Amino acid sequence: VRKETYSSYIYKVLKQTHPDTGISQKSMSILNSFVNDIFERIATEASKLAAYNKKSTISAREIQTAVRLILPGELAKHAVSEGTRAVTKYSSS
Amino acid sequence: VRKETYSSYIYKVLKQTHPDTGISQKSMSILNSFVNDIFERIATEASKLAAYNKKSTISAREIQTAVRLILPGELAKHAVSEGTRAVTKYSSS
Amino acid sequence: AKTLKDLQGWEIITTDEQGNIIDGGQKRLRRRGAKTEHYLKRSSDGIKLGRGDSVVMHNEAAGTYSVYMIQELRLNTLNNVVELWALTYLRWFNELYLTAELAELQLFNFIRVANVMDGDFTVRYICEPTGEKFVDINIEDVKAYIKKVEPREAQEYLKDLTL
Amino acid sequence: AKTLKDLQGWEIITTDEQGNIIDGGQKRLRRRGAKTEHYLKRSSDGIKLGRGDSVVMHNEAAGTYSVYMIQELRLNTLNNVVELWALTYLRWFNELYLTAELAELQLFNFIRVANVMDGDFTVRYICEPTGEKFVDINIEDVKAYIKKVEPREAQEYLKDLTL
Amino acid sequence: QSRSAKAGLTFPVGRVHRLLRRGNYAQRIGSGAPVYLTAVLEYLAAEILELAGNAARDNKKTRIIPRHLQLAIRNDDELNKLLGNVTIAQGGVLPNIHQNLL
Amino acid sequence: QSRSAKAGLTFPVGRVHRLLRRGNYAQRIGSGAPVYLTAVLEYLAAEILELAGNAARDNKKTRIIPRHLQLAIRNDDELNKLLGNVTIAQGGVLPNIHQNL
Amino acid sequence: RKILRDNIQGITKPAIRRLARRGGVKRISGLIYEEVRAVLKSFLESVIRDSVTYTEHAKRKTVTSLDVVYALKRQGRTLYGFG
Amino acid sequence: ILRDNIQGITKPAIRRLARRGGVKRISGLIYEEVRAVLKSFLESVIRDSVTYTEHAKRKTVTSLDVVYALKRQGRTLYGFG
Amino acid sequence: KPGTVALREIRRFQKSTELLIRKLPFQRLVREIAQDFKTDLRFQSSAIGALQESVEAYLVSLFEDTNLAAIHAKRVTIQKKDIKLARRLRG
Amino acid sequence: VALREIRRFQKSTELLIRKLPFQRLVREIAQDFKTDLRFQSSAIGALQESVEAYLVSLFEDTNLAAIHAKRVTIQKKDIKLARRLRG
DNA sequence: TCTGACACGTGCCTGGAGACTAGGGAGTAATCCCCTTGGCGGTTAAAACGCGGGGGACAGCGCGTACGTGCGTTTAAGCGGTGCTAGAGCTGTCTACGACCAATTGAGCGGCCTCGGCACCGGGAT
DNA sequence: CCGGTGCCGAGGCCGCTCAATTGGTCGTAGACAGCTCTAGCACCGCTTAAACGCACGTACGCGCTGTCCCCCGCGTTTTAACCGCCAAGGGGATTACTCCCTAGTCTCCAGGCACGTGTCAGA
């Protein structure tokens, strides 16, 4: 009871490209801890990066700079290209 | 201007055991960054340690557990023995 | 462009292969080998800004125009809303010399495009801001290596073509 | 002791060398080689609780007393206000067998001290809870290695003295 | 509709915002930061899921076992540079040999 | 009379408490936590300063140079394990040689 | 209260052999099985002690999978699939 | 403009660093490999420092920014902040 | 032929993903190591397998680098000096 | 002559790598990330004291990699393994 | 024998300390099960031991080639001293954006069927 | 791998507490704006340590061989690892309430920061 995992969202984002591929519960917990560790890494990097500028808030630029810090190479470029597209489709409404 | 360091306290704790030994300003900045790195290490350990038990109050138990997690060997064994001996004199007054 | 207030005159065109397609948000997947390309055309006239194009822009302090040869463009960086690394040109203070110096162009300077080749402008030789090493090579030989290969080797390619 | 409510009957005696001194808060410095020792005596009668002493305490479920041979004591750990790793003894269910099993004793159980040696109690042989390997060695031979050497080697020393 | 439906994503914006507020990262939290974070980790989960699906389709299997996730992470260069200090449960090892052995 | 004097230490308890409050490490902070961190910071600084003074006395110098601090750190065992991923500026390297050279 | 007298010998020699065949080792010397078990003891003496301090911070008496995965997360040996 | 500046650090400088490391003899083919190691190392550190500076809307990489970038990479430098 | 079924065992254990280290001796080892830290300390059964997976992935990463150090030293067998180097090259 | 140079460069704490070549090197590397980007005068010295520490920590381990293989002169394959084993 | 940076009184001002309030989070007691541990049979899959051998490990050697070292020789590195100027770090407004307080509600976390792709066999070529 | 049961485990289906969402409202930290001054860049020059070569012996890298011995591998014994199953028990949850302890806000003041001139290292 009251375990906020990432099971159904990962299962939904799997089936939107490869709908004929199942996923085990152990691999589901692996991906849950995977996105939880990436969330903890980006959140701690944004916390330290907002502390380094004497700021009190975390905007989208803070998380964008922290995720360009953490992820290496072209994957970070594709990640920020996805994130900026999503926030421009979100906020412009 | 109005940038707080630990310079005078390091100088005072040096001048009560080795009173005839000076200290350079470069080594002063080295020791200041050293104790600042240890401070942020213990703080970021106690933050994630209090997050693991769903608490919101960092106490002497949290910092004592984080500093026996960070410092290796008998150095932590002398460190917690000094810390408890100091906080008993503090809270006993 | 600098920010989203200046990014209201361009859109993200994400060509997957050498053909011109979009296929959603950058193929919806990160795919190696098939290196994606992005040239952003304005909706007023459709002027392409691609990897190897020569754009014209007035300088921030001079006022006299200058040509920038685009080496790379990175979508949605931190300070800028899109970054653009472009190779500079040498002004005669109409023949324009080539320069392998990278710089960054903002959207409030770019006016028109001009494919500067040898005989609206005329290239003579690759040069340097030091003032020597004139190598009479046009821009048609390096644009294929720019478009085909990532610029981590094309930088050393046009650095070795000089000197 | 468990907490500070039960730690009001002992004080920290920090002997630097083999002699009995205090010299402030653990020599005011961390010094290698001269390994510091701590035996905590109660202010009622001055009974020493040292590295190698055999204390008597009633068990938490049995009620019948048991002897604990102190192997190590660590000042101001996390759960307890001071931790005490002591070797257990075998009850006859008056001869007491030795056991190399570590355990932890709390302050609300310890009553008296008793230097159990061979012929208030009598040791016969080191044994095990399995019920065999009786090695007729008294406690006087191992207390010097306990007091002189850190227990990381004394654990393997009395483990190799058995079996 | 929720903020995830307004963003065009399938990952929870409000759960990430609640975890950011309860994780003691800052006193204040901007508006674009949780939707940016959900977009980033949604793209990361989608990429690791499609690479695991490619590893499963290269083994003629459908259910993604953790061995498929290990062989999908370690075969990619930038994911292995990202997950350099990782340990995956039931992953085994890469199929790898050196030329100075055979 | 102050908080650091009531603790009996030479390091600021109030600055540690203010930096713990402003550093986003928790929502609430107990009383014993900043004085415990003050005590352990004072102990660590006192130990590293005693070892640096030992290096300065063994090198016939009256001021702590960074070479004295690096020799004091790398000559110790547990301080080197605590500061393994630590590079000190203007200090060079610990003097050691291999037997097979 | 089990008399586990040097159970580091419980990791037997064909177990280290199988681990080396997984790692890609053709043949192993005979003076390695005494060393690899000491390396394993030195590694577990760090990570198990970190997990014990983690689980006795929370006034508990069970070492759960969250405790060992957090102790491995702090040591730069981040395990997945448990929390 | 700036090109082949990795040959500015020369093989006697690598000889000095190797004598500080404690070698006796080194090869003549290790210099390009040491330059290739240093290139990737300074590339990662300079890229992280540039990211830290470009976050703060600055146009000058500070010593505090580069010591934060070295702290994040597990190579915590002292004496600068 | 000698030395060809070792490559067969390598190909068997590289395609597989099972647990090479046994469960109960590793459990007894973890218990006797934590015996010096807390008496009567029970372990969750998921945590023992978690420690086993971390030990396995650490030991095969040590053994791969050890075999690489032996290969660089113009040998195909490993020695104690290789693992001593790999521990002094990884802290 | 050799071990005298080891004893000289192992006791003194001078700047081994030169200042202005290191300046031009970090400027050439940073020019691919931000053009017209300035550097603090303490930041380049911090980069030098970190780079010459990492290189010495690499060299004092590839010397162990050389003497492990019963040889004195190091090779490119020594430092390749010395970086590849931990980085 | 020389001098050139490091350390004791110096006004202050602004951050630390005391006091007086509530509110809210931990800390005592309290169920009750949801996980362990443990000891039983069992049976068998690796583990242990012994020998053969043969192929790699170590050691000596001899041809030799790349490398430390010695001595010109450029030559670019280090210090200084300019000028200048780009931007870091301030103060000041205010403003736009987030925290916090109720209301609501779909949603996304738990039970519950309902099938369905992987296992490992005969045995067949891998 | 054909393919057959089967199985046990994920996939839809239902479904109901509850935290995500909306709406005002206040309040408060960042965004512009100036400034200013400060630390960093360029450049010329002046010495000047030192990188850059050529020889040159020479000493270790490296290929060959030769011995030898130690571990790979197989065959027999053996023994405890895995399974499982029941049973006991104990500690990890989750109320609960309360209480005391710490955030907030004044409140007073003092302490520790920036100069600074007297004093102490190096060559």
Numbering used by the authors:
A (entry chain H), B (entry chain D): 35 to 127
C (entry chain L), D (entry chain K): 2 to 94, 130 to 155, 170 to 213
E (entry chain G): 16 to 117
F (entry chain C): 16 to 116
G (entry chain B): 19 to 101
H (entry chain F): 21 to 101
I (entry chain A): 42 to 132
J (entry chain E): 46 to 132
Question: What does the publication say?
Answer:
Orc1, the largest subunit of ORC, is responsible for Sir1 recruitment via direct interaction through its Bromo Adjacent Homology (BAH) domain. Here we show that nucleosome impedes Sir1 binding by Orc1^BAH^, indicating the need of a suitable chromatin environment for Sir1 recruitment in yeast cells.
To evaluate the potential impact of crystal packing, we determined the Orc1^BAH^-NCP structure by single-particle cryo-electron microscopy (cryo-EM). Complexes of Orc1^BAH^ bound to NCP at 1:1 and 2:1 molar ratios were observed, and their structures were determined at 3.5 Å and 4.0 Å resolutions, respectively ([Fig fig2], [Fig figs3], [Fig figs4] and [Table tbls1]). (A) Left panel, 3.5 Å cryo-EM structure of one Orc1^BAH^ molecule bound to one side of NCP; Right panel, 4.0 Å cryo-EM structure with one Orc1^BAH^ bound to each side of NCP. In particular, the densities for the Sir1-interacting H-domain and several peripheral loops of Orc1^BAH^ are poorly defined. Nevertheless, the density for the H-domain of Orc1 still cannot be modeled, and the same is true in the crystal structure, as only one of the two Orc1^BAH^ molecules bound to each NCP contains partially ordered H-domain, indicating dynamic nature of this region in solution ([Fig fig2] & S2). In the structure of the Orc1^BAH^-NCP complex, the H-domain is mostly disordered, indicating a dynamic but accessible protein region for Sir1^OID^ binding, while the β4-β5 loop is well ordered. Orc1^BAH^ itself no longer binds the NCP with 20 N-terminal residues of histone H4 removed ([Fig figs6]). These findings point to the cause that the movement of the β4-β5 loop away from the Sir1 arginine residues by ∼ 1 Å due to NCP binding creates a setting that the β4-β5 loop and the H-domain cannot coordinate the binding of Sir1^OID^ ([Fig fig4]). Structure comparison shows that in the presence of NCP, while the H-domain is freely available, the β4-β5 loop is displaced with respect to the core of Orc1^BAH^, rendering a nucleosome regulated interaction with Sir1^OID^.
